[PDB]
């Protein structure tokens, strides 16, 4: 009787596949050749932020596009002033094993999660003048990939429990829990409209969920290894994944398919962190060969190289202003590339 | 130039930087050990000697160096996705029990795990400190059981000393490099602090070797 359900499952998978192929009538490569490429992109280092004495594993900008919080493995996450390279704050962590550090869009809070299965929320603007822990969001049973803020009261986390949860700062329990991934989810990206989010796991599959409802609407496949990074396209209708095959594939939410792969034979290492630009024409990528790449999100040809780091770039993010790009690698240095 | 508030903001950052380096130099004078091993392979007993939901960090001190141990093999998770977090550790403490050589393939699983982590890209230079636990019961069970059961292509006398020597050399041959990475062997001698003295000596050795390598003299 179970084989009948298996037969139905593969039949539905086949019918979805051919419907997906039928809707596929062209490729992005055959049309972007019509429009001229930008050419060569030079990313000169502007700010080097030398405060950490251990490898950093994540960083995040603020919506102000000037403050950025970076968390390293030395046990302290630092709030930086990009324009003047100043340490606004230094928050000692209760566990040095930290994988992520988010920033509230209002700038009031900073979150942090790691191998302790807790995303602890810190309060910045306080009466006493010292950064204090607001909440500890335990109850995940698995190491934490990344926390992301919706508001000052809602946060979405993706842990090694092979699940994603929507917490509530004032209460402390996860109101909505997203499940369906098989392996541990290693990345999460929030759509600009803040209504859907895409998570990347070890299943080599990326799927998006209805934040309001709580279940996935569709799941994309095609990757060969674990997806280490996912970032949304600024228009909110696409996202570019990142695996250990050095391929930054790009998918469509409305077309429910994949537009174009970003494969270069010179790179066979892993991808650590991908991102887009404010316009979305060029997508950056953080590779495992100590240097950062700058692709072309429409033409799929490398439009530059950002190679100022002597170690693998563990994270990179672009200001919503669009001016600078912060790349933080294991040499404990944050470098700003305008 | 800079205004009054900008000047005071810079002074605040420099004060933060001083405290960061102060805590940084304090943490540098401290040795981190990645403890792991098979289930009930002496880890539950090693922590009781080296103490007095993802990371169980055991904190204790000795003559000096303020050893720190992060028990990671007890929790049940994936294999090698957080293994990059522990790169740069001073040493790895592998606890392999000799009483699992007859229980069913546990000895094979421990040896394969040893081979996987000894040749790993991250731990190319980090030393591994062995701990062969349950020595007395190992002698009793090899008295009650033969030795060729574990290894089909190996033959030898059924004595404690040759079996301990043969398993020790078998473990040490599992690595692909010998010049940079070093393996230190022991047998968890009784329950006193003699194990703590051994790990202190081994950690002292690897610190000296890496210090000379930094000086370009090794």
């Amino acid at each position, epitope marked *: 009787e179970l084989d009948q359900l298996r037969q139905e499952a593969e039949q539905l998978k086949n019918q979805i596949r051919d419907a997906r192929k039928a809707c596929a009538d062209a490729t992005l490569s055959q049309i972007t050749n019509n429009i001229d490429p930008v050419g060569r992109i030079q990313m000169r280092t502007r700010r080097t932020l030398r405060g950490h004495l251990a490898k950093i594993y994540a960083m995040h900008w603020g919506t102000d596009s000037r403050l950025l919080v970076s968390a390293s493995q030395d046990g302290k996450l630092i709030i930086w002033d990009s324009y003047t390279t100043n340490k606004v704050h230094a928050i000692p962590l209760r566990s040095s094993w930290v994988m992520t550090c988010a920033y509230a869009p209002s700038g009031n809070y900073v979150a942090c999660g790691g191998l302790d299965n807790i995303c602890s929320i810190y309060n910045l*603007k306080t009466r006493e*003048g010292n950064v204090r822990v607001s909440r500890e969001l335990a109850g995940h049973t698995g190491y934490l990939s990344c926390c992301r803020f919706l508001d000052d009261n809602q946060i979405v986390t993706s842990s090694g429990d092979t699940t994603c949860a929507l917490w509530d700062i004032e209460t402390g329990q996860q109101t909505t829990t997203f499940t369906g991934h098989t392996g541990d989810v290693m990345s999460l990206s929030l759509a600009p409209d803040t209504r859907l989010f895409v998570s990347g796991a070890c299943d080599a599959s990326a799927k998006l969920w209805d934040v309001r409802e709580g279940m996935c609407r569709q799941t994309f496949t095609g990757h060969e290894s674990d997806i280490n990074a996912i970032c949304f396209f600024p228009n909110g209708n696409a996202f570019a994944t990142g695996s250990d095959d050095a391929t930054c594939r790009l998918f469509d939410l409305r077309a429910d398919q994949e537009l174009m792969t970003y494969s270069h034979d010179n790179i066979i290492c892993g991808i650590t962190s991908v991102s887009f630009s404010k316009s979305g024409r060029l997508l950056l990528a953080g590779y495992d060969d100590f240097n950062c790449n700058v692709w072309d999100a429409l033409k799929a040809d490398r439009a530059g190289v950002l190679a100022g780091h002597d170690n693998r770039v563990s994270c990179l993010g672009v200001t919503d202003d669009g001016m600078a790009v912060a790349t933080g690698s294991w040499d404990s240095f944050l470098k700003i590339w305008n | *130039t800079l205004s009054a*508030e*900008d000047k*005071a903001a810079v*002074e605040r950052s420099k004060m933060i930087d001083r405290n960061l380096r102060e805590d940084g130099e304090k943490a540098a004078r401290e040795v981190k050990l990645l403890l792991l091993g098979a289930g009930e392979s002496g880890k539950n007993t090693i922590v009781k000697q080296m103490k007095i939901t993802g990371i169980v960090e055991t904190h204790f001190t000795f003559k000096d160096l303020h050893f720190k141990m992060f028990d990671v093999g007890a929790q049940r998770s994936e294999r090698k996705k957080w293994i990059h977090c522990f790169e740069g550790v001073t040493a790895i403490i592998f606890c392999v029990a000799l009483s699992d050589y007859d229980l069913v393939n546990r000895m094979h699983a421990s040896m394969k795990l040893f081979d996987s982590i000894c040749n790993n890209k991250w731990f190319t230079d980090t030393s591994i400190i062995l701990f062969l636990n349950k020595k007395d019961l190992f002698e009793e069970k090899i008295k009650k059981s033969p030795l060729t059961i574990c290894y089909p292509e190996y033959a030898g006398s059924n004595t404690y000393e040759e079996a301990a020597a043969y398993i020790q050399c078998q473990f040490e041959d599992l690595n692909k490099r010998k010049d940079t990475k070093e393996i230190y062997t022991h047998f968890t001698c009784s329950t006193d602090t003699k194990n703590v003295q051994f790990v202190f000596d081994a950690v002292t050795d690897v610190i000296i070797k890496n210090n000379l390598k930094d000086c370009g003299l090794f």
Partner: single-chain antibody, 231 residues
Framework: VQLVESGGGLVQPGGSRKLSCSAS????????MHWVRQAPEKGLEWVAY????????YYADTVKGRFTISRDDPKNTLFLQMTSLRSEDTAMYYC??????????????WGQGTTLTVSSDIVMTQATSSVPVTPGESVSISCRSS???????????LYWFLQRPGQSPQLLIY???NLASGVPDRFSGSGSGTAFTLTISRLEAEDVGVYYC?????????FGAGTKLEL
């Protein structure tokens, strides 16, 4: 949080006295500290300042050498010891906390104050000193400067303080535009170099007091003469 000072009393001219302020409820080491002198009838005047960790000390040119300040961070106490007092030092002294980073609000909290009786700067001028108002009426208060307070980084370092009759003044707006935390949104502020204004919308009770404009572009921090509201 609260700042409580003590050690004020009548002295003879040429004598000495030391003023101590006790802090509690906040990280006293992370905050700079200011002393401000409020004359018996006149407006606010600045005295001295100590940075965090006592790495920087500034004095008003009227009390240079004659006064000296110190802090003991472990016991959360601030000191102001004065020697050879003059007859013009009879006033009320406040201890004001101020912490400086990006997006901070210096002079956020003011001490209660201790009485005391003895028997080239950027001049901040307020054209008016007393304007009658009634509840429910919008009133604009303007205070000029002898130099432009706009800096090259975009910050216009101008502050406004409201001293209700009976207690210490409090911060209303910092950098002439940013409302301080805990104040009603009815207040407002804008302007430019050498021309600043504070427009209050829908005036009500508990808003009556003397409004002081303070510049923080450079030391000493000259205050304004103050504009008093009446009903």
């Amino acid at each position: 949080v609260q700042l409580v000072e003590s050690g004020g009393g009548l002295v003879q001219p040429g004598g000495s006295r030391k003023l101590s302020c006790s802090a509690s409820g906040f990280a006293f080491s992370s905050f700079g500290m200011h002393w401000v002198r409020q004359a018996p009838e006149k407006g606010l005047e600045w005295v001295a300042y100590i940075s965090s960790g006592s790495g920087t000390i500034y004095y008003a040119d009227t009390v240079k050498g004659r006064f000296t300040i110190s802090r003991d961070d472990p016991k959360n106490t601030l000191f102001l010891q004065m020697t050879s007092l003059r007859s013009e030092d009879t006033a009320m002294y406040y201890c004001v906390r101020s912490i400086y980073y990006y997006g901070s609000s210096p002079f956020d909290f003011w001490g209660q104050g201790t009485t005391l009786t003895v028997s080239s700067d950027i001049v901040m001028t307020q054209a008016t000193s007393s304007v009658p108002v009634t509840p429910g009426e919008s009133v604009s208060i303007s205070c000029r400067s002898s130099k432009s307070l706009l800096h090259s980084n975009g910050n216009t370092y101008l502050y406004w303080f409201l001293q209700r009759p009976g207690q210490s003044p409090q911060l209303l707006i910092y950098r002439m535009s940013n409302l301080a935390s805990g104040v009603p949104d009815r207040f407002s502020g804008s302007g430019s170099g050498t021309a600043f204004t504070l427009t209050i919308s829908r005036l009500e009770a508990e808003d009556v007091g003397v409004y002081y404009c303070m510049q923080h572009l450079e030391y000493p921090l000259t205050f304004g003469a103050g504009t008093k509201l009446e009903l």
